[PDB]
Point group: D2
Chain length 493, copies 4
């Protein structure tokens, strides 16, 4: 398997410079300008993430315009993702807009609407009306970004709870609350999300990073919110709690991909468990054939330091080893002091990790999991990747309009670059979260319909030659899968 | 493997009406008429074998004409094979046309040409001029169908050998002789063979069953005897002795196929070893991707009896289990009393054997033997057959003009019929010795060169429908190797 | 698999002198004397089969005594098998003790008891009372060893059938009848069988070859007939018809082994099917870990001819290739003209077949079929045989007193001889139908109980040495099933 | 594969409270007392590491005595490891005890002994006398834990080199230097190591963590230094540079185990490559059947903070996923503020990692790698672990006196606890670096020579039974040669 593969490796060999993993960068104050964006692109960014939990529509409109320009100027295609704010539990108001909590002392959390303004350090409101229930004695209540920690001990009545302030901390008006291990029942898409999602559709974003998904039904709600004009936008579900992890199979089923939000998962789940959860969610996505993003606290110390820690480096490497399609940067690029350096370092780690990755294990493991009989395209994509291993071909050319085939082929993990030739420019952008693929845009209006596909195959091969994947004499596997089937093993000229 | 597969089988289930193995029938007096040939075709014959060790050119010309007519009227394509006589060793004549050999007696066998017509029980001739330098003391000399056996003891001169008659037997004029364990050096192709092969080329036979092949070099001699006008005729090498078995790897390499002549091999090898030899030669041909024929003493007793023995039935079944492409009938159809019945019974045994055969074992065993990296064709044909197993497709359509691809695909053993669409009618005939394939002729002169392959693919699919292999809704794997190409179609 | 193995073989390489398959010989006139028996033993016989469908109890008593003496003199252990007659259906009597049947003739068979002596060529009796109900129009009725065939077409009344004589043949009194494809649901053990089995138990036979077993219930009936004094006798079920083949799984389950009676199966099932059936029954037995015998029409022509046919030679070889534990000889040894030559030729074919057999395929195949988890015994025997393949050990020594372990180890097919050391002489005899095993008797009343198994292990290794299987320096795998496995460095 | 396995997992069900990985703790000022050691043992410490690069023989004698007593008091066996100081290339002294290096600035690095005290930013000393001959122009010279990077440009003469200061950095007296792409012929056992090793032998330490092993012959020098009275002490080679990584095959061959010193390897090797190096070295040791330790910068932030970082947690987990036998703690326990908490957290991470680990993969991989034919021992241990998988046995009992068998069985990775019964107390301590094993001491002097192994097997089973591994009706695989599958009574 892989253990056997490690025995044959050496770090003193040249690393065949091809990076399959993709990097997503969160845009912010230190990276919003066009020039800062081009630098990010030249450093290795494939997707530009807009964190909608902060910033106005005019702010994000600037990001959208600057990304599209920076990309245009450099001649590439960069995906634009809208990361949703999601549902949120905020407290009521306080008398004097403040409430000084202190260590060891008691307080009372009521489900009574009358205290929405009469809040004091002794008794205040929390807008989650199913409070006295989902909350038992011994549980914890995190308030204000998880800084303040209360410890429930009994219920005064059907609306109030008696808590102990476990640590001193001052809290102002309406600051979010978290309920560790408690099954909350908040709606998927909030009113704010609904408004932001319609904006995303109008601006033509490529994908949505849907916050706090815990149900297959919730994914459906996000679709409706996008409406018919946003039927082609991908919905990447952010798994941020235990429910999302429990219902992972059905959520993956409905979604277009998954994001493992380690930091959010870590709020109520032990760190060591989050590690294991990451392995599970990534492997399940791999088998499903949908992109998976390793998402939080990546190269964290680089947000201010020019060099990351020993541990941060291995964390990035292992996300790749786990099978992640993409790795993400949040504050490192959003408010960081070294935007380009973090991305460059991340790309470097991904390249190195790849050289050691035994992709034949993935191919084999994904083949054994296939149910027999399987459908035509399933069989075609496996055989095409099988041929790659058999002939030791140096590249694959997949003609896919919607990116469906490219994503299916990539699932089998060939040990060579995959070049996708599409007539859709959005496919070029959406494939940016799929590992080991590169898209070549074929203009049907400027170069004709190519009814016969040869021009597209030629385009894909020329790109492969251009990049140095294949030289005259090399073998290249070509495919066409759904919309209506074909595979060729070409001798590159 | 095959073990596990046997556990899931049942003799009560319906046999999937499809037979992959092919039947070769030797034509003779009982079967030369066009009406007898038609019946042989209706019974299961795919190839008509002409045994050239007997009969003239007018005799075989009749067989050739009658086979074409019988096939034409029935609307099928039947291959025509010319089985060569090969180099022969025979004694000279005797005084009184006879020579009574007696056990324990002493005689002299010589190479001296003067004793051609002067032969006696004490001293006679043998036309193999190297007899003395090849044979050693202690060796045996079989004469007259191996009935008479003498054992050489010493050299009288540089032309004569002193032998002991080990058993009583009377021999008449010019009877055949066999040299067990002897490295004969006779020319690959004799005189008559050179003449017969030039007749075969003129008449357009599809293949040659070359007798007594010993070296790869000998195959080359046959190739040349056929000349440039016969470059497309296949050469199936008949392995009839220990040398052929010893040099089997190189012989398979140059030949277009092999024939395991069990009876001939049995003249100098213990029956039980011939059985094992059969397994070896068949497996080697399977891996090579060249047709292999299990050839002698098949359904032997049915020549005169309406029913075969239990042992003959298992022998035919095991030839198929071994991996033989074809099974052959000699005297059963040539001079037999039940021509149609033997062929019918043979086909029935092959059909039954097939239902029990685990073809996935062949596929995976063949895949495991290929070297990485492999050539494009090799990789395409395996992936195509792999897809068949994956999608559980019910048929394969192979566009092959020379039959090269069809033969390569068939090597991987898909568990479904293979339909080959060719623009050559001779490919339709030659593929008759490759198991599990059926050919569909596409006339490129009367239909268009079909660049794009759409019409040919349609033709292959229609044929698969007309035979009931696939229905609307079914998957069918399509291939074209030499541009490369593979498709999994949905039937309509 | 076998394919990849065939590529590496050469018929010019020397074969080993180790034969795993076993030979069963049917004793008869030609071979009953203690002189003829010793010749059979020297030729390759491991089991002496007594066909109880003919001969008296005194006749078989002689065979039993002569076999035990012949064996005693040659210092070996030979198993004794009693082949049961099983139920049989037979016609009534005729006027003049005869009835000339002719081609075309329209006759009537009657379930009516009144015609049990009033038989004539136009109307006669058949003792199977469910005759008229079970037999339909179009079916066939075989009479007198299957020589006379008759096709039914209609019912006269509720006891008689109208038949056509399809071939001319004269039949005398009480001659057996066969009903092809018809579910003749006759009993397990007949009265005769119940008497013969009682005799077999008193005489100490090692196994029973139970005729016409159709179901798992029937095996139970045979076990009952043997009683408590015969609990250790093995019941090998002879599969001779379609029912036996259908219910094969449950029959193998309750039996101690199976016999594939090809000729009997061939009466109603087409020959080509019998071939396939043979493969199926053998593989099923292999997986089950129970001995399977390829039984009829083996080397037929060698009954009167000094040499067999090509086809007969391949049939014997393929029975071994199929996985048969034993191959059997009936008339060839019972009334044959060349008793010793047939057995010798058969052994020769088995030795040759073995040299080409890829036993790793069997091992691989049996290991794969194992469900996960498995019992301790199951796990130990596989790992022991696994170690044999790993270390290229040249012998295995199995301490088994009932032969259970030896039979389980043998199931995994090690590519080396298996030596079983037992304290029971009957185990030595019974293991004679299990392929690739040889038994060594350890006399516990004369040598001690040997706890710690030291002496027994030494005996097994000593035999392996004396047989030339292992020489100083080789590895030998030792086993006992309380579990235990060793990989002994030979001295 | 592990992929298949991950699909069946769930962080919401139980975890057999069984931990196969072992924890090594470096003893120091904040963990030297008998009371602090007992706390470390209760938290999860199996091995006590003595860093001999600082402190006198009297300081370490106290650690030795306190470890012995803390262990005795609790009733357990704890291994004692002596981590060698090893050879070192330092610089000489400077005028004013300082030397401000600046970018672009040219300086001269010499071997001349006269500048051992006259050092200046312009020209200074380096105690590696073969420096000029080992180095070449274009190479790099790292000084002060690799912070200062200089680049060789030319040879001024047979003793001096002309270098460019590639980055600004101030360096004080005698600081360590590293030579990134150069093969160094430094002596394996320095004079100080020679002395420390004989002390280790006299005090009966269980293993040596040999610093800076760059070659196979070097391991031999360490054996010669331990002498005949220390032939039973294990030599764990610390791989700290590119040569050790390059000659890893032969080093593993001669050593008794390996230690992957990530931080030391990181001085000259890019962090991302050290990660891959870690995978390679661990897999190589796994196949070899010798213990491997993931060694530096583990849960580092927890030396000051009560909680580690996200990344530190995954680093520890992945060391286990890689196949490491042991994970180590240096400053976290030596001078840390939360000695017990770090060890406890580390154990917790190892337990969790284990629950997700697919040990069948290890077993299977190793089996496809063995040669055929194999030795008896090799074949017996694999079949024994095979049986474990076959019967779903819940424990293994290995009677091993030297620990060789226990270590070979552990190599195959059974998915159940391994219980080793020994007549040697040092074997109990040495097996503390082998993952998934637990030792039971059988006192041959106060119980008998037990020829027949009856009593020892019983002891192993009672321990398994007492540990809750097996109960009546469970299968237990036990292992001159013999293997058994028992039915627990």
């Amino acid at each position: 398997s892989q253990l056997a593969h490690n025995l044959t490796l050496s770090i003193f060999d040249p690393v065949a410079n091809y990076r399959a993993a993709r990097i997503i960068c969160t845009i912010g104050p230190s990276t919003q300008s066009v020039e800062a964006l081009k630098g990010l692109i030249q450093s290795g960014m494939s997707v530009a993430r807009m964190n909608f939990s902060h910033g106005s529509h005019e702010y994000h409109q600037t990001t959208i315009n600057n990304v599209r320009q920076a990309a245009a100027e450099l001649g590439v295609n960069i995906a634009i993702a809208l990361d949703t704010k999601g549902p949120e539990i905020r407290t009521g108001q306080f008398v004097g807009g403040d409430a000084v909590m202190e260590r060891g002392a008691t307080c009372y959390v009521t489900t009574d609407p009358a205290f929405a303004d009469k809040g004091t350090k002794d008794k205040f409101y929390i807008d989650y009306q199913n409070l006295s229930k989902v909350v038992r004695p011994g549980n914890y209540i995190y308030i204000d970004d998880g800084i303040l920690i209360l410890q429930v001990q009994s219920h005064e009545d059907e609306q109030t709870l008696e808590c102990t302030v476990t640590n001193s901390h001052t809290i102002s008006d309406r600051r979010g609350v978290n309920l560790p291990g408690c099954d909350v029942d908040l709606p998927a898409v909030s009113a704010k999300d609904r408004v932001d999602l319609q904006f995303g559709v109008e601006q033509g974003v490529d994908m949505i990073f849907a916050s706090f998904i815990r149900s297959a039904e919730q994914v459906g709600d996000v679709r409706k919110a996008l409406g018919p004009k946003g039927r082609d936008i991908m919905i990447i579900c952010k798994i941020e709690n235990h429910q999302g992890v429990q219902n992972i199979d059905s959520i993956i089923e409905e979604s277009d991909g998954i994001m493992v939000a380690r930091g959010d998962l870590g709020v109520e789940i032990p760190a060591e468990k989050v590690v294991v959860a990451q392995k599970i969610l990534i492997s399940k996505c791999n088998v499903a054939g949908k992109p998976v993003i390793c998402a939080t606290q990546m190269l964290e110390s680089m947000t201010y330091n020019p060099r990351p820690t020993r541990a941060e480096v291995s964390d990035v490497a292992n996300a790749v080893f786990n099978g992640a399609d993409c790795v993400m940067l949040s504050g490192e690029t959003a408010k960081g002091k070294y935007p380009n350096e973090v991305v460059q370092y991340m790309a470097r780690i991904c390249l190195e990790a790849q050289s050691a990755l035994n992709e034949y294990v993935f191919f084999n493991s994904i083949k054994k999991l296939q149910h027999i009989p399987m459908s035509a395209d399933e069989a075609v994509c496996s055989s095409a990747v099988n041929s790659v291993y058999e002939t030791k071909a140096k590249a694959m050319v997949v003609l896919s309009n919607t990116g469906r085939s490219a994503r299916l082929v990539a699932k089998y993990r060939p040990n060579c670059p995959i070049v996708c030739v599409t007539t859709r420019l959005q496919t070029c952008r959406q494939l940016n979260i799929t590992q080991g693929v590169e898209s070549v845009f074929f203009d049907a209006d400027k170069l004709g319909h190519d009814e016969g596909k040869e021009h597209r195959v030629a385009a894909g091969v020329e790109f492969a030659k251009s990049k140095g994947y294949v030289q005259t004499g090399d073998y290249c596997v070509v495919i066409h899968a759904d919309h209506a089937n074909q595979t060729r093993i070409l001798l590159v000229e």
